[PDB]
Structures are given as C-alpha cells and as structure tokens.
Amino acid sequence: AVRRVVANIATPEPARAQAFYGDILGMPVAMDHGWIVTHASPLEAHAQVSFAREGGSGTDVPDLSIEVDNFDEVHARILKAGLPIEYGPVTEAWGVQRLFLRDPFGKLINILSH
Amino acid sequence: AVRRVVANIATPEPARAQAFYGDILGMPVAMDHGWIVTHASPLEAHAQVSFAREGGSGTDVPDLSIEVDNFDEVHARILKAGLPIEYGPVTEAWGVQRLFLRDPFGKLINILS
Ligand SMILES: [Zn+2]
C-alpha cells in the first residue's frame, strides 16, 4: 500500500528551494538532513503520480502540478517576486485555473486551483 | 495553501504506467483523460517535495520516493515481475529500508518503508 509519493529535485544546494517552495508556495521545511531537505504543506493529500503526453492545451508536460487553495494570492506573490510566467494564467476547459512558471532549478511548475 | 503536489511523467503512452504503478505498486487509475492518466493510492500524507544533493549513501538522486507499508511484499512483486533492482534492499541510517529500481519511463524510483 502506497503511503506517499514525493518528487526529489537534484541540487548541490537544497537551500535554493526556500525562495520558491517556502516563500511563495508557503511550504515550511519539514525535514532537513543536510544532503536532503523536504518542504511540506500543512495539508494532506492522496498519494498520486500522473503520466501525460502533453501538459494540456498543447503545452509541454510540467514537471510538477501543485494545487493551491488561493490562486489569486499565489499569482500576486509570484508577480511580486518578479518571476516570469511561462503560460497563463488561464482557466482550462477541464475546470482548473492555472499558470506555468520555472522554479529555482529550471523545473516547469504548473500552479493550479479548482 | 498547497493542497497537492503531483509529479507528471512525460510519455507518448500513459497506459505503460499500469505495469509498474498499477500492477506492482497497487495504485489504480484514478483518472483517465487520456492525454493524462493519474494513478493513486487510498492513503494520504502532507503534500511535499524534496531537494537533495544525492540519493543518500552516495546514490544518484531518485526521481521519486515512494513510501510503502509492506516492503517485503513489494520487493517480492518486483522480483516476480523480473525487474532489475539498481540498489538495495538495504536498511539506511535514517530509519528506512529501501531499494531503487527503474520505472517504464526510465525514472529512478526509491521504494522505501
Ligand atoms: Zn537539474
């Protein structure tokens, strides 16, 4: 029985995650073993993994899809941090509002909300 | 504010996930769309993502870390499926037993308990 699935992003300096996952996405550090750092949300979700031929609407497949509960807030934080947005925001036909942007490690992040 | 973190694996054919995520890990299709297919478990944890200089014990950083309740059963399933194990099983210093293997898409998967 699968309890959690966690993506691991390779970096010589895990502290580089703080600016995006910590500050913008509001995920405090949950575990810090030095060679690995985990950022986590106060919430609480089924273990899942997705397999995709495109990101939808003809986009590239994002490395991670991160669902947030106040999209307009996250959007404003991203803008205030001066981060370029690669796609969106746009409301998709399948009933999400989302944008793509790059994280500190060049991963393509899909930030979405119901 | 973050409700979920889900990795997406790029593939021309999502159906190829069933052999590993479905048949070995016991995560059935929760959603099929079918440009995208999500496999899911009935268990929950905090949404999280990790950032690592190495996989631990000098290993490569695994693409995914997947925590399972019944390590010995998964290990047996893996072997019976004829899948090569790249690392382990071994019990690590940070209180886990784990092994690494490749998924259908070439991703390095850390299965741990
Ligand atoms: Zn990299």
Side-chain angles (χ1 to χ4, degrees), chain A residues 2-3 6 13 42-44 49 51 60 73 76 78 85 90 101 104 107:
Chain A
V2 170
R3 306 169 55 148
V6 187
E13 183 43 280
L43 329 162
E44 276 144 337
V49 48
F51 303 88
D60 293 346
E73 180 155 21
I78 285 161
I85 292 174
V90 64
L101 77 168
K107 299 291 177 189

Side-chain angles (χ1 to χ4, degrees), chain A residues 1-4 6 41 50 67, chain B residues 2-3 38 41 46 48 67:
Chain A
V2 170
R3 306 169 55 148
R4 83 189 155 142
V6 187
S41 168
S50 291
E67 194 192 329
Chain B
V2 168
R3 293 172 61 87
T38 298
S41 160
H46 286 263
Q48 57 209 71
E67 183 194 335

Side-chain angles (χ1 to χ4, degrees), chain A residues 46-97:
Chain A
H46 280 24
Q48 32 211 309
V49 48
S50 291
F51 303 88
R53 52 179 182 71
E54 48 141 323
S57 290
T59 57
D60 293 346
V61 178
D63 292 295
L64 303 173
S65 289
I66 293 176
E67 194 192 329
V68 298
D69 71 353
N70 196 324
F71 184 87
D72 300 312
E73 180 155 21
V74 185
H75 183 203
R77 287 183 195 186
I78 285 161
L79 293 173
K80 292 175 175 182
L83 301 182
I85 292 174
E86 299 215 332
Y87 171 82
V90 64
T91 302
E92 303 282 4
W94 54 94
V96 299
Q97 175 175 41

